[PDB]
Amino acid sequence: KSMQCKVILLDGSEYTCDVEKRSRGQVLFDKVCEHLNLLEKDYFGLTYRDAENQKNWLDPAKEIKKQVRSGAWHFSFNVKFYPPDPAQLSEDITRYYLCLQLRDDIVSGRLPCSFVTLALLGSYTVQSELGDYDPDECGSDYISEFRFAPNHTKELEDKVIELHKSHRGMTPAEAEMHFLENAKKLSMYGVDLHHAKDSEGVEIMLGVCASGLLIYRDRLRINRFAWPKVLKISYKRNNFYIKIRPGEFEQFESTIGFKLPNHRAAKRLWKVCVEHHTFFRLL
């Protein structure tokens, strides 16, 4: 009567459970959040890979079986909605899971940042995980197992140690809050990037986030539409559309369109925009 599910958690461990063959995604998500003692679960979600090898969010309202065709019900637990101000979350654990996601976002290269910031972020991770710097625990070797960046240098390793020394007395909660104050201001913080083409076939990326819909060309942010200004989000076939009122007095409506690689891509973008629009209105 049941299906085994496997979920990769943010610390790299794996959660296994069984659900009924006709369960909605909510059943599995609730089990995972329970396992994690996670109360502020609306910021999080589960992703799977479809038959094209594309990442998709599992829709909690729909049967798992309609979404994951394969019986390989294998998911990843991730941050879905990155809070714009993590200090306003109710629980330290929520912030801890957010930090685990952000460390991965940094190490994988998905959240770029400056050497200076990488080193400061690292130093908070180290203070959180290891506590106070101490010569009798802290040899030259003591952080060779942390990854602080996509590419590791010794100049980075040395600056992390220097900044760690300065944090003496900081509790893990304070260290995590500083980590998050710094991360939340990074330009790509919480931005879900999608390949698309504009009206003149030029290759761009569209980024979905709490602030709005962002447009990049050549690693350069060239536009931004805040969600309150976005009046309609729709798709048709391989195309995604937003409706706005341009101009100083908003006297007319304009629909801007983007070409994605296929209907599935346009539908995924559309869904992730609509969910973000909704979430960050109600927040």
Curated annotation (Swiss-Prot):
Organs and tissues of expression:
Expressed at high levels in brain, with lower levels in kidney, intestine, and testis. Detected in lung.
* Domain (FERM): residue spans on this chain: 3-283
This protein's GO cellular component annotations are: cell junction; cell-cell junction; ciliary basal body; cilium; cytoskeleton; cytosol; glutamatergic synapse; juxtaparanode region of axon
Major place of residence = cytoplasm
- Record-level Gene Ontology MF annotations: actin binding; cytoskeletal protein-membrane anchor activity; structural constituent of cytoskeleton
Q: Where in the cell is it found?
A: Cytoplasm, Cytoskeleton; Cell junction; Cell membrane; Cytoplasm
Name the Gene Ontology biological process terms: actomyosin structure organization; apoptotic process; cortical actin cytoskeleton organization; cortical cytoskeleton organization; myelin maintenance; neuron projection morphogenesis; paranodal junction assembly; protein localization to juxtaparanode region of axon
Alphabetized UniProt keyword annotations = Acetylation, Actin-binding, Apoptosis, Cell junction, Cell membrane, Cytoplasm, Cytoskeleton, Membrane, Phosphoprotein, Tumor suppressor
Q: Does the UniProt entry include the keyword Cytoplasm?
A: yes
Per the entry, what this protein does is: Tumor suppressor that inhibits cell proliferation and promotes apoptosis. Modulates the activity of protein arginine N-methyltransferases, including PRMT3 and PRMT5.
The UniProt subunit note reads as follows: Interacts (via FERM domain) with CADM1. Interacts (via FERM domain) with PRMT3; the interaction is direct and inhibits the protein-arginine N-methyltransferase activity of PRMT3. Interacts with PRMT5. Interacts with PRMT6.
Protein name, per record: Band 4.1-like protein 3
Native source species: Homo sapiens (Human)
The encoding gene: EPB41L3
Q: Which residues of the full protein are shown?
A: 108 to 390 of 1087
